[PDB]
Design an enzyme around this catalytic site. Structure first.
Site, short mmCIF file in Angstrom:
data_model
loop_
_atom_site.label_atom_id
_atom_site.label_comp_id
_atom_site.label_asym_id
_atom_site.label_seq_id
_atom_site.Cartn_x
_atom_site.Cartn_y
_atom_site.Cartn_z
N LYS A 99 0.47 12.91 53.42
CA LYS A 99 0.15 14.34 53.35
C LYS A 99 0.75 15.10 54.54
N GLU A 156 -10.49 21.30 61.68
CA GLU A 156 -9.71 20.10 61.97
C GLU A 156 -10.44 19.17 62.93
N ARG A 157 -10.39 17.86 62.67
CA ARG A 157 -10.82 16.84 63.62
C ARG A 157 -9.89 16.89 64.82
#
Lengths: 508, 464, 47, 464, 183, 92, 114
Positions: free
Chosen positions: D159, D185-186
């Site tokens: 991805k 987002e992490r």
């Protein structure tokens, strides 16, 4: 008209130590009037020697949650503010201790030599302070290190039902670090914090005994919020563990944190929130219950070389109800974490212990968390188990099935036996590289399925006692070199002639 | 100097006091009811401080006949109950008044109901196996002598018959002291226990405390803490090993849920109180046994709507060492004692403690019964003859293992007519080791049902 | 050949049953959550 | 003149203002935190007016260390992000502060994130197809110039490589720009993306905006409008085609529900905000073409429980115009970019928008790949020889078709060193029209892996 | 359905307590009040008329959901468009049997009523015959003819977007198929 | 079940917060206080008795429902009258 | 039986038993179809489908939708027809003969039309 505005401004601007007084107390909350300069999260102290967090500030009162011995509070008690936000002592003196979520010793041994103090709520390392998670946190579980590898700096969720081995997988993970701790090299030497939230006291004593029996109390801290302790201690326990860990991480040590369970962290924060009349959301949790777990877990990181290159690895545990991984708290922590070791109770009863449901369990870090020898040996393992997980419907028709896939069905059955492992028996990476090699290279293919676990154990005992140079090579060079592979195949065929199966048949 | 009632709303009573005279949390307050047959002294426990010198209280007895502005006097201390050797062989209510002989306990040492659990320094894990002589319990869920045992189950799945059998097996031979707490249990089974313990002469060593479900939420809460503070006296001050039976421990948290809305707490998931895990933890942690002094707790936990995802069952499961787990599915098949073999669990069931010969057999039985539950969906629709010869053999073993886990219990004399049986652990392991290796596939499936071990299995099979 | 044809039919019927049940379990999941919320915010509005 | 904090309840803060100086809603306000360990310039967004000059704000940063009665200054505009060419090559938080070099971009033009979508009269009345130049995308799931594309990624399924590819396509073919809205987002994978785009040297044409999970739901909600306001400047003022990535649009819906619950609003449906479809509308309706220039979007979308009827995915899929799906079952074959030809779909694959020839060819390619997906069970269980001559004549084509959907692409130029290829739409159609009729059946499968159109197929095949 | 979701938003912002599917109790008095405006007036009132075509988005074809069944109970019929027929290329995807008009057939012109007067049944019996015979080896010649007729009636009834046929052309196009000229 | 529905109406008009299933918290202490007040007395109280046959209507034949499982736990036994047995000729 | 009489009650319980057994086979029918049942169940299900269809009728209100006329069936003829159906006199007629039809003489007329 204008005079009332000037006078109200001068009254509010008019606002030794500040004093409040309790006006309400109930159920673990005490509303304090006064304290005009109180800050959110400030430690209040009450006259019995009790503490509270000042977690909510209203127009005329301060909603302080109470951290212990709450029965000793009354209306009209004089409340003093301490000058400090929530903070906990830290240092190497915590290694081997059991502490409450204020860093006070609860094991009944001597008082901990606090090296430093950290606020519970200091920011997580930003995207510019971190580094890619390029080195392994060996768990010593064949079903994790070969299929959902954990790198030091990752956050791996040990999600599952009750009584499926979640505590046991984390205690195997903490025990496995001893073989790295004995080498006095701070770059190998992982430290551990086990944060017990809402355990019963005897369960934390069982885990302490299971860690002492494997020498892990040389380097493990327990932060114990047993269910006896107030909702405010069950809520702070993960942040007390994360602050003790963060002190070692910022010094360039490597840390592992186990949160057991984040489901009872959330259920304590729900209790505190609903008592504070805060607005409830889905499943009665407050609106910030995601922010509770994200600000907890995201503090687990691998730092850049400029911050000493330390790291903290989070192993949060959560207890799903009836396997419903789609519940609120499961869905939160599944979206915050980097991977998910889904334990399942049917796989646990089918003998598949440690019960990891591979092929829904995932690690988003992937191969970067494995040594090269483990990548070369185990890369095919997920494909062989996905092919076996398709073919298991044909176990009744093994004679009619095409021979090319019959050799995948019997292989899969011998790999599923190979991934079984008794508790408190973590394998060093050097030994599970060879265990997975027995399977994926097909040396097990002639062993009867019921004897595979004894064949693996007796082979690794033989190789460890007589052929330590295979393990020494894999360890010191991280690669299963061709000359070590050819010697390994030779000693497997040496041993396999002396092995005796359940039926007493020969092998090969 | 004394206070007065301001507001009354079901079992919850608000009381106002003079500025300096506000009582501490959990004090007992006395108020008088003065109408007719309802005329009683009423005991209120201080649950909250509302501010303005008001306190909110939960009534230990029904508020019917209570009048606004009646005088309320604080006792100066918490609710207290009699403790000592002389409470054995008597029946008490939550307030510690004897039901059998009113006023009996008034010269005893009285201990406060509320105390802290023992410190973590005082706790050690217990690993002694308790032998009950029930096949399913001793095989799949082995009990811990000094641990916290439980009998989970939905409504009516026979929990109270199983707990009365567990009293009759353990407390009959047991050389120490026993306590029985009646927490929101059916009074009929409280009396059938009381006369059964008198007939078996066990009553001379058993103290019973009953706060049955005809009682208001105040006493259904404080009865579990009252019986527990008699067990905590026998543990701490006498060091004589204790059994503590509790039916039904869920009713503690339920009665807490019933007052919580009137106490002005906001309702949590599925309408429990928010304090659920802090109320239940503050009770359950006191039931532990410190080093050198065992309490063998045996607590039946109700499960609302049979839903083991329900927060009260799901929170209770953390506090326990061996959880027997009854189910309506197994009950509806007549497999009384109705223990679900796959849900039920024990921490002592490991090959370090029970030994490999037990552990292997328990795991082979669980693996077979698990494969049988994986196959019941196929068997209901496609039908048994479709299956592999190995799967079909396993099904014909699982159907026999299911029935051989059922047993004629001594408490189930009325359910079955036949007398009860005790199966020794060695005979239990030998019988299931035979069954799992097929050594009884030639016997008819009915021959295993309700039967007390191998000697009775042989006599039943040859009777068919 | 009839066992093939009829067991293809039984597989397509078991897939149309998994579909219809997954749709029902979703409608029940959403109704259980909606109901639970409606009861919680009803108890917040009453206070 | 300035306001005062009067209440704090986690992220929610109430600010009193003088009678005149009350700010309009969605203004940004700044408050001090002065405790040394937590010193911050705390940013507040105005959510409601509570009456009596009081404003309910939601905090963009942790409120830990806020003091009642601290001074709050009104900035007199909404949250405003820096915009320009100068935001390309940088990473920003949701408030428009650079993470890589603090204080960067404060000299730039600032645009308020809260601005209306384009007027009805400015919208384009027909769906232009985006000629991205990917074979699989241009044929099976044609993208829409100014539409939204769902992107069902996963762990390791390339991805991030498809993201680096699409960034290279828009930067190089259209002379456009990308913006990356990291919604929730992490922080680990947000750093892994920042270093991956730096190492690929594509960062130079991308502006990243990260709303990290560390933050209160105020910035996880506003980050998608911050990145969309940077894209709205690149479309309106610079006149560039933009590609706005959003990862993950479900976490924008979730963070909106958490803010709604913090503000005390009654939850709707399965517990979302009541405003859900209207604030999803405020985000998605704003991604569109105007005046011959566009914002295309790729939105990674989570689906809770796999439930495509759940109000969060259902409101999301009410907007987006194509679905790209990546599968490990395709990536494990080496078929990069691993777009699943059968699970992926587009609303533009109809003979009214694409040509009749395109629609016929794409329907035949789907028919062949559907037959092969049905046959892969027989292939695996029985082996290829069990198929007829006609079924193997189909599989021989299907294998080569699925391989010819793989492409050597500008993201793979980092590792293979060989240049990424663009394939024209007419050449893609004409190649798959010949390939489905079987005109290349004599070539081996290896000749079709990672190849840049038909002339390049001939070049590889003759040199193999 | 998006008006229903907007009146849910307004109602929950006003804190009016929700009912089923979190919609307020009067989400039926939203749509019913709206759709009852649509009427054929008498010649006393001018003889004017208003025809309401409400649309409703179902979710995975849950035609038994709350808002679908509210609007099905208000309106005089439904044209249930099935997504499984739409993906098979039958466009418009009218799912017969479950699609119906309960005021129609009184207003349908005589010629259309003569040509279509069996067609609804001839299609419903074709869909059941095909669902059966897709998993059978063989069938009688009369059933095989009725299967082929039904498949050519389905191919007769589909049509491209933005091509509305005048009634004088629709009656002829249905004549082709019902009289068997397509066989 | 209709007494439990009437006590819900009474409690919601008095505006007590609903518990689960919208019932009042003490809907158990409605039925326990009702049913536990019938039992056989001792010979020291004339030895009289009262026998309760409560009835419950299970909406859609689920035995595992909130009010059903309260009354199943208050009472000493069940006679679960399955409508599917009743139709297939098995009556009672 | 004290109100409708012995015969009407007996017939109505035989019909309800047949339809109950059929609804309790529907979980197998939905997967495998009819033939995989035992013969005693397959005999039952064939008449259950005939009874399930013979409970349909061409109503007087239905004429505005179907164009066909309505039918009225007297109670005596209703009991007689379901007595014959449950005793199994009509298992030789196809299921399509029973849809939307009023009484035995009209069932015969429709069976002749097929």
């Amino acid at each position: 008209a204008a005079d009332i505005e000037g006078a109200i401004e001068d009254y509010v601007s008019s606002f030794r130590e500040e004093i409040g007084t309790v006006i309400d107390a109930g159920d673990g909350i005490a509303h304090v009037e006064g304290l005009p300069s109180v800050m959110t999260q400030e430690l209040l102290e009450f006259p019995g020697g009790v503490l509270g967090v000042a977690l909510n500030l209203d127009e005329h009162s301060v909603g302080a949650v109470i951290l212990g011995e709450f029965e000793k509070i009354e209306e009209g008690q004089q409340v003093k503010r301490t000058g400090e936000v929530l903070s906990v002592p830290v240092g190497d003196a915590f290694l081997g201790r059991v502490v409450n979520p204020l860093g006070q010793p609860i094991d009944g041994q001597g008082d901990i030599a606090a090296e430093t103090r950290r606020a519970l709520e200091l920011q997580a390392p930003s995207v510019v302070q971190r580094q890619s998670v390029s080195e392994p946190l060996q768990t010593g579980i064949k079903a994790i290190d070969a299929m959902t590898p954990i790198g030091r700096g990752q956050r791996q969720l040990i999600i599952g039902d009750r009584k499926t081995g979640k505590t046991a997988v984390c205690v195997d993970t903490i025990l496995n670090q001893r073989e790295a701790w004995l080498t006095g090299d701070p770059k190998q030497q992982v430290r551990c914090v086990y944060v017990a939230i809402g355990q019963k006291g005897t369960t934390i004593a069982s885990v302490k005994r299971a860690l002492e029996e494997g020498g892990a109390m040389e380097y493990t801290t327990i932060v114990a919020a047993p269910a006896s302790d107030a909702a405010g201690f069950k809520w702070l326990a993960p942040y007390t563990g994360s602050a003790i860990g963060q002190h070692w991480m910022y010094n360039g040590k490597h840390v592992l944190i186990v949160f057991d369970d984040l489901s009872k962290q959330a259920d304590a924060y729900r209790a505190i929130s609903l008592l504070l009349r805060r607005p409830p959301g889905r499943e009665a949790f407050p609106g910030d219950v995601f922010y509770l777990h994200s600000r907890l877990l995201e503090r687990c990181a691998k730092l850049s070389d400029e911050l000493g290159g330390g790291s903290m690895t989070g192993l949060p545990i959560i207890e799903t109800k009836a396997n419903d991984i789609s519940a609120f708290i499961p869905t939160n922590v599944i979206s915050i974490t980097d991977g998910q070791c889904f334990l399942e109770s049917d796989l646990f009863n089918q003998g598949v212990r440690p019960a990891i449901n591979v092929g829904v369990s995932v690690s988003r870090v992937g191969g970067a968390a494995q040594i090269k020898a483990m990548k070369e040996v185990a890369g095919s393992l997920r494909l062989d188990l996905s092919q076996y997980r398709e073919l298991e419907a044909f176990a009744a028709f093994a004679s009619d099935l095409d021979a090319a896939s019959k050799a995948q069905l019997d292989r899969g059955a011998r790999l599923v036996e190979l991934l079984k492992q008794p508790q408190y028996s973590p394998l060093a990476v050097e030994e599970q590289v060879v265990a997975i090699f027995l399977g994926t290279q097909g040396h097990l293919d002639s062993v009867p399925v019921e004897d595979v676990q004894r064949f693996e154990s007796e082979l690794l005992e033989h190789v460890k006692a007589s052929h330590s140079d295979i393990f020494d090579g894999i360890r010191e060079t991280k690669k299963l070199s061709e000359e070590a592979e050819e010697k390994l195949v030779s000693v497997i065929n040496e041993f396999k002639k002396g092995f005796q199966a359940s039926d007493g048949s020969s092998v090969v | 100097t004394a206070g007065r009632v301001v507001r009354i709303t079901g079992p919850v009573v608000d009381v106002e006091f003079p500025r300096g005279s506000v009582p501490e949390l959990f004090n007992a307050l006395h108020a008088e009811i003065t109408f007719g047959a309802l005329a009683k002294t009423l005991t209120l426990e201080v649950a909250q401080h509302l501010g303005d010198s008001l306190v909110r209280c939960i009534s230990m007895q029904p508020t019917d006949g209570l009048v606004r502005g009646v005088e309320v006097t604080d006792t100066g201390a918490s609710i207290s109950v009699p403790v000592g050797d002389g409470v054995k062989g008597h029946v008490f209510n939550a307030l510690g008044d004897c039901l059998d002989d009113p006023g009996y306990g008034k010269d005893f040492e009285h201990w406060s109901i509320h105390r802290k659990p023992p410190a973590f320094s005082d706790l050690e894990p217990r690993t002694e196996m308790l032998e009950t002589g029930l096949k399913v319990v001793d095989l799949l869920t082995p009990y811990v002598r000094g641990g916290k045992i439980a009998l989970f189950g939905g409504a009516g799945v026979g929990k109270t018959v199983l707990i009365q059998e567990m009293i009759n097996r353990i407390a009959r031979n047991f050389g120490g002291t026993s306590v029985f707490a009646g927490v929101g249990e059916r009074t009929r089974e409280g009396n059938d226990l009381w006369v059964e313990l008198a007939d078996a002469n066990v009553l001379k060593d058993t103290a019973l405390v009953f706060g049955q479900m005809d009682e208001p939420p105040g006493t259904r809460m404080r009865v579990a803490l009252s019986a527990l503070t008699m067990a905590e006296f026998f543990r701490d001050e006498q060091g004589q090993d204790v059994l503590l039976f509790i039916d039904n421990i869920f009713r503690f948290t339920q009665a807490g849920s019933e007052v919580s809305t009137l106490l002005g707490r906001m309702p949590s998931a599925v309408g429990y109180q928010p304090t659920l895990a802090d109320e239940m933890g503050e009770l359950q942690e006191r039931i532990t046994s410190t080093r050198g002094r065992s309490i063998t707790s045996m607590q039946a936990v109700y499960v609302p709507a049979d839903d083991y995802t329900d927060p009260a069952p799901a929170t209770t499961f953390a506090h326990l060492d061996a959880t027997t787990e009854l189910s309506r599915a197994v009950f509806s098949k007549g497999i009384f004692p109705a223990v679900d073999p796959l849900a039920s669990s024990s921490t002592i069931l490991d090959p370090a403690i029970v030994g490999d010969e037990h552990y292997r057999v328990a795991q082979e039985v669980i693996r077979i019964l698990q494969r049988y539950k994986d196959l019941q969906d196929i068997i209901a629709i496609l039908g048994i003859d479709e299956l592999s010869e190995e799967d079909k053999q396993l099904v014909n073993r699982a159907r026999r293992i299911e029935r051989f886990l059922s047993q004629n219990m001594m408490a189930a004399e009325q359910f079955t007519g036949q007398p009860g049986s005790t199966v020794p652990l060695k005979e239990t392991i030998e019988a299931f080791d035979k069954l799992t290796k097929g050594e009884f596939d030639h016997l008819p499936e009915q021959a295993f049902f309700l039967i007390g071990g191998l000697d009775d299995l042989a006599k039943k099979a040859e009777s068919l | 050949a009839s066992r093939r044809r009829a067991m293809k039919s039984a597989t397509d019927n078991a897939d149309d049953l998994i579909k219809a049940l997954t749709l029902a379990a979703n409608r029940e999941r959403q109704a259980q959550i909606t109901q639970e919320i409606s009861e919680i915010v009803g108890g917040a509005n009453a206070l």
